[PDB]
């Protein structure tokens, strides 16, 4: 049955718009196969199209916004693009039609509506770019009956091992198609849909923009050669209309020009399915997917007071649909320093200078290829896998579709090397590398990231204890299937645990360090004078200078989270030897959190170093780090330490702003200094952890139940309304929020863990 659910999840999830780095495109979960991409731009002059054309996601003054209004990767979705520069409101509706043996069929409608400001007769160029990688696959444009291009539909006929036989149709579309009475029309036609069919080596097919412009430039070179000149120039839209040359190749460019409003359809028909897809199919399936999205949303994300209103519901659907709509399929080589240079052990003072010298040897090499199926923080800015972000992304996704969440976790754990390392940042293939400066591509096998993916597995275990609709819950509805998933994953989870203890070890023994345990102490590798990027809290102030004796209380808490998950999953699997080892470790972390990281003087947890005089010194910077044992749920609800942390959380003069908890206390000397990234702003991911833990305490007998209930109620309200007000005014989820003003700041489209807000609204954790 596990096998069967496997095959059905593959077939369900194979096709999608799994190219979140571009406005609209499709690819299957196959490395070397069929990819599609949409381009558009106004053309008003001989030189503006190069500057107006849209392909890869950006955010600037020229784009009002964009995002998914609805999405489910099994069914499809509707995306809205609001383009100020090109005067266009675009709708891309995508829908999946199951059948046959090759992951089924799909359809998309592209709709462009000129905004009020645009000239009514604006000319818009639209390109549908189709590419196919694979040594023994084929794709052919069926020629038109007509001389110069297509009056109707364009038909591509294709074959591969992976997809079988298929046809891809770009429909004629609705809208005015401009006509040229110029002399050139004798040789290029008056104006019509055109197709150019090309071949390049498989590894450059992704470079859609340069491949297009190279064809456009050949077109213009031909005009200059053939006496079309400034005495009598063709109109700009005809100078930029490719000469029709359909045929066979691994690239197919389908170009249309519209005057005013336009729409056209893309119909992908898997031959192994029944009848080929029609525009009527598309319209029907789009209606259906919308009804299904509506029904699932009211079940899965039932928003509780005071967020029951339609305005909060619209907000929730937008925050949710952008998070799940960010799911991409990435394939290619990763850049990795496999030197394991000894400078990376960081056992000396000044270790960051040694580590710099090792990096400057540039021993990194490309390795893989690898594949990843994952949600992303940011389409325009960070369209790739981030290890601790994904833990946050999958909490709402797992509610919606636990089986999808488990596929993504599986995809992440298939990246783990023999040692138990997954790169914190997954830059797979040249297309992914193009969005990243060379200096920042290289991953390091000694750099960890919080294991937030365990928090999702915790939600799954609690659920496992206590056809699309069926597939979505098959791994909890069939406990046999769920246990078997954990059985295969468990060894990887245990390998990572051991990797953390081996590679991120703190030094107790070699200093005057008293503690209940000689084993349990941890230090994030990879820290520089002003940063600790591996912790995920880039510039939170840490002990100065960095030191091999440093201990980080957040890292110990994360190991705590891991052991509690391994106890749970080990138990379900009856790994009794293993569960006994974990239990001793958990008891040891509970004691050493206190002996090594608790400040009675400050009333909070702190990182440690060793002094100028080689003694253990606590270093207290009141903020998120200080709360970590509480945030990761390691503290008993009756703990006096917890009560002191609730006093810090609630204190307006330290962390409590009207807009949520400040990353750093207003009292801390590093408040609003340097880049001020994690040194004051309100971050939705850590606020979410705090809201879940306050709720935990509010729903138990104990001495802080009522303090927790009050703080839970207000914190939930402050975080949701801050993100809501900003979405209302700007159309964006933001990366962080200003604790003085409430404004969203840094990066837009952060869906992204800011989308945790859908879960905070639905409550009942």
Ligand X SMILES: O=[N+]([O-])c1cc(N2CCOCC2)ccc1NCc1cccc(CN2C[C@H](O)[C@@H](O)[C@H](O)[C@H]2CO)c1
Ligand Y SMILES: *[C@@H]1O[C@H](CO)[C@@H](O)[C@H](O)[C@H]1NC(C)=O
Query: Which residues are catalytically annotated?
Result: 538, 735
Q: Least separation, in Å, of the C-beta of 66 and ligand X?
A: 16
Cβ proximity to ligand Y: between 10 and 226 the closer is 10
Q: Least separation, in Å, of the C-beta of 204 and ligand Y?
A: 24
Q: Least separation, in Å, of the C-beta of 136 and ligand Y?
A: 17
Using the rule CB under 6 A, is 403 a contact of ligand Y? no
Cβ proximity to ligand Y: between 394 and 461 the closer is 394
Residue 166 binds which of ligand Y, ligand X, none (CB < 5-8 A, kind-dependent): none
Say how far residue 614 (Cα) sits from the centre of its chain: 43
Cβ proximity to ligand Y: between 27 and 42 the closer is 27
Residue 140 backbone class (left: φ over 0; alpha: ψ -120 to 50; beta: rest): beta
Residue 747 binds which of ligand Y, ligand X, none (CB < 5-8 A, kind-dependent): ligand X
Cβ proximity to ligand Y: between 371 and 607 the closer is 371
Q: Least separation, in Å, of the C-beta of 410 and ligand Y?
A: 8
Cβ proximity to ligand Y: between 96 and 749 the closer is 96
Residue 549 binds which of ligand X, ligand Y, none (CB < 5-8 A, kind-dependent): none
Using the rule CB under 6 A, is 29 a contact of ligand Y? yes
Residues lying near ligand X in the complex (CB under 6 A) are found at: 377, 381-382, 386, 388-389, 440, 536, 538, 747
Q: Least separation, in Å, of the C-beta of 683 and ligand X?
A: 8
- Rounded Cα gap, residues 455 and 391, in angstroms: 7
Residue 377 binds which of ligand X, ligand Y, none (CB < 5-8 A, kind-dependent): ligand X
- Rounded Cα gap, residues 685 and 35, in angstroms: 34
Number of residues binding to ligand Y, judged by CB under 6 A: 3
Residue 519: CB partners within 8 Å, gap ≥ 6? 508, 585, 588
Residue 382 binds which of ligand X, ligand Y, none (CB < 5-8 A, kind-dependent): ligand X
* C-alpha distances in Å from residue 611, one per residue of 548, 549, 622, 653, 699: 11, 9, 20, 30, 43
Helices (H) and strands (E) in the chain, counts: 22, 26
Q: Least separation, in Å, of the C-beta of 303 and ligand Y?
A: 34
Cβ proximity to ligand Y: between 11 and 738 the closer is 11
Listed residue (266, 277, 290) closest to 99, CA to CA:
277
Helical (H) or strand (E) element with 280: helix 279-300
Q: Which residues pair with 618 in a beta bridge?
A: 608
Report DSSP letters for 389-434, one per residue.
Answer: HHHHHHHHHHHH-HHHHHHHHHHHHTT--TTS---SEE--SHHHHT
Cβ proximity to ligand Y: between 169 and 471 the closer is 471
Residue 412 binds which of ligand Y, ligand X, none (CB < 5-8 A, kind-dependent): none
- Rounded Cα gap, residues 318 and 761, in angstroms: 13
Q: Least separation, in Å, of the C-beta of 441 and ligand X?
A: 11
Question: Count of CB atoms within 10 A of residue 764's CB?
Answer: 7
- Rounded Cα gap, residues 182 and 587, in angstroms: 84
CB 517 within 8 A of CB 509: no
Cβ proximity to ligand Y: between 30 and 758 the closer is 30
- Rounded Cα gap, residues 269 and 34, in angstroms: 13
Residue 29 binds which of ligand X, ligand Y, none (CB < 5-8 A, kind-dependent): ligand Y
Residue 381 binds which of ligand X, ligand Y, none (CB < 5-8 A, kind-dependent): ligand X
Residue 386 binds which of ligand X, ligand Y, none (CB < 5-8 A, kind-dependent): ligand X
Q: Whose CB is nearest to ligand Y?
A: 10
Q: Spell out where 525-567 has E strands.
A: none
Residue 262 binds which of ligand Y, ligand X, none (CB < 5-8 A, kind-dependent): none
Residues between 353 and 372 that touch ligand Y (CB under 6 A):
371
CB 32 within 8 A of CB 133: yes
The 3-state DSSP class for residue 734 equals strand
CB 583 within 8 A of CB 576: no
Cβ proximity to ligand X: between 378 and 626 the closer is 378
CB 300 within 8 A of CB 350: no
- Rounded Cα gap, residues 16 and 108, in angstroms: 11
Helical (H) or strand (E) element with 123: strand 123-132
Helical (H) or strand (E) element with 65: strand 63-72
Cβ proximity to ligand X: between 124 and 378 the closer is 378
Q: Least separation, in Å, of the C-beta of 408 and ligand X?
A: 16
Q: Least separation, in Å, of the C-beta of 409 and ligand Y?
A: 13
In this structure, the strands spanning 63-72 and 138-141 are: unpaired
Residues between 75 and 104 that touch ligand Y (CB under 6 A):
none
Residue 371 binds which of ligand Y, ligand X, none (CB < 5-8 A, kind-dependent): ligand Y
Q: Spell out where 607-665 has E strands.
A: 607-610, 616-619, 656-657, 660-661
Cβ proximity to ligand Y: between 162 and 187 the closer is 162
Q: Least separation, in Å, of the C-beta of 346 and ligand X?
A: 21
Residue 434 binds which of ligand Y, ligand X, none (CB < 5-8 A, kind-dependent): none
Report DSSP letters for 77-96, one per residue.
Answer: EEEEEEETTTTEEEEEEEEE
Taking the CA of residue 59 as centre, how many other CA atoms within 13 Å lie in the half-sphere pointing to its CB? 19
Using the rule CB under 6 A, is 10 a contact of ligand Y? yes
Using the rule CB under 6 A, is 311 a contact of ligand Y? no
Q: Least separation, in Å, of the C-beta of 383 and ligand Y?
A: 19
- Going 455 to 461 to 466 to 467, the CA torsion angle's sign is positive
CB 522 within 8 A of CB 506: yes
Cβ proximity to ligand Y: between 33 and 56 the closer is 33
CB 67 within 8 A of CB 324: no
- Rounded Cα gap, residues 239 and 198, in angstroms: 20
* C-alpha distances in Å from residue 188, one per residue of 175, 191, 240, 247, 626: 21, 8, 11, 17, 70
Q: Least separation, in Å, of the C-beta of 428 and ligand Y?
A: 12
User: Which residues would be at the binding site for ligand Y (CB under 6 A)?
Assistant: 10, 29, 371
């Amino acid at each position: 049955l596990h096998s069967e659910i496997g095959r059905l999840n593959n077939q369900s999830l194979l096709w999608g718009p799994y190219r979140p780095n571009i406005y609209f495109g499709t690819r299957p979960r196959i490395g070397k196969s069929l990819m599609t991409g949409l381009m558009w731009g106004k053309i008003e002059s001989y030189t503006d199209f190069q500057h107006t054309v849209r392909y890869t996601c950006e955010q600037n003054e020229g784009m009002k916004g964009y995002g998914w209004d609805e999405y489910d990767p099994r069914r499809g979705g509707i995306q809205s693009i609001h383009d100020i520069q090109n005067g266009l409101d675009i709708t891309t509706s995508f829908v999946k039609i199951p059948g046959g043996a090759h992951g089924g069929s799909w359809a998309a409608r592209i709709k462009g509506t000129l905004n009020d400001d645009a000239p009514k007769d604006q000319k818009t160029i639209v390109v549908f770019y189709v590419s196919q990688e694979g040594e023994n696959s084929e794709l052919e444009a069926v020629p038109s009956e007509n001389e110069f291009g297509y009056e109707g539909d364009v038909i591509l006929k294709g074959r591969s091992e992976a997809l079988g036989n298929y046809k891809l149709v770009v429909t004629k579309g609705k809208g005015v198609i401009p006509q040229s009475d110029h002399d050139l029309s004798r040789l290029r036609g008056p104006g019509q849909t055109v197709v150019q069919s090309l071949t390049y080596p498989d590894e450059v097919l992704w470079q859609a923009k340069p491949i297009l412009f190279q064809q456009l430039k050949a077109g213009i070179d031909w005009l200059v050669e053939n006496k079309y000149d400034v005495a009598d120039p063709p109109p700009p839209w005809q100078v930029y209309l490719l000469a029709n040359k359909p045929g066979s190749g691994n690239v197919h460019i389908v170009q249309k020009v519209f005057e005013g409003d336009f729409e056209f359809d893309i119909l992908f028909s898997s031959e192994s399915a029944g009848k080929e897809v029609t525009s009527k199919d598309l319209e029907r399936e789009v209606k259906q997917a919308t009804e299904v999205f509506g029904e699932r949303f009211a079940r899965v994300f039932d928003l509780k007071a005071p967020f029951q209103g339609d305005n909060y519901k619209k907000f929730g659907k937008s925050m949710f649909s952008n998070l799940i709509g960010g799911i991409g399929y990435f394939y290619g080589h990763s850049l990795v320093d496999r030197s394991y240079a000894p400078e990376y052990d960081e056992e000396n003072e000044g270790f960051w200078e040694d580590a710099a010298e090792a990096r400057a040897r540039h021993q990194e090499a490309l390795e893989g290829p690898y594949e990843l199926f994952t949600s992303i923080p940011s389409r325009p800015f960070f369209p790739r896998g981030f290890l601790w972000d994904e833990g946050f992304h999958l909490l709402p996704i797992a509610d919606w579709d636990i089986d999808l969440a488990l596929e993504i976790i599986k995809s992440w754990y298939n990246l783990m090397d023999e040692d138990g390392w997954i790169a914190r940042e997954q830059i797979l293939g040249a297309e992914a590398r193009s969005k990243v400066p060379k200096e920042f591509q290289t991953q390091y096998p000694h750099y960890a990231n919080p294991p937030t993916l365990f928090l999702v597995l915790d939600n799954f275990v609690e659920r496992l204890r206590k056809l699309d609709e069926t597939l979505s819950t098959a791994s909890v509805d069939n406990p046999e299937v769920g246990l078997e998933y954990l059985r295969r994953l468990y060894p990887l989870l245990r390998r990572q645990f051991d990797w953390f203890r081996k590679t991120q070890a703190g030094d107790i023994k070699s200093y005057d360090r008293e503690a209940y345990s000689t084993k349990e102490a941890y230090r994030w590798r990879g820290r520089t004078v002003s940063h600790c990027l591996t912790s995920g809290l880039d510039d939170y102030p840490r002990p100065q200078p960095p030191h091999p004796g440093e201990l980080h209380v957040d890292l110990m808490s994360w190991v705590g989270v891991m052991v509690k998950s391994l106890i749970s999953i080990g138990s379900l699997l009856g790994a009794t030897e293993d569960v006994e080892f974990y239990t001793k470790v958990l008891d040891a972390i509970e004691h050493n959190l206190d002996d090594l990281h608790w400040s009675e003087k400050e009333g909070c947890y702190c990182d440690a170093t060793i002094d100028e005089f080689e003694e253990h010194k606590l270093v207290c910077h009141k903020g998120y780090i200080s709360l970590f044992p509480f945030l990761t749920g390691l503290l008993k609800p009756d703990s006096p330490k917890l009560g002191k942390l609730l006093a810090l959380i609630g204190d307006e003069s330290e962390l409590w702003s009207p807009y949520g908890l400040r990353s750093l206390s207003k009292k801390d000397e590093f408040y609003g200094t340097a880049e001020n990234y994690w040194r004051s702003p309100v971050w939705i991911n850590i606020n979410y952890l705090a809201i879940v833990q306050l709720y935990n305490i509010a729903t138990q007998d104990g001495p802080y139940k009522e303090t927790a209930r009050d703080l839970y109620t207000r914190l939930r309200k402050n975080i949701v309304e801050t993100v809501y007000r900003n979405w209302e005014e700007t159309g964006f989820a933001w990366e962080q929020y200003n604790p003085e003003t409430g404004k969203g700041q840094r990066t837009q489209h952060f869906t992204g863990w800011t989308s945790l807000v859908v879960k905070i609204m639905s409550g009942h954790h």
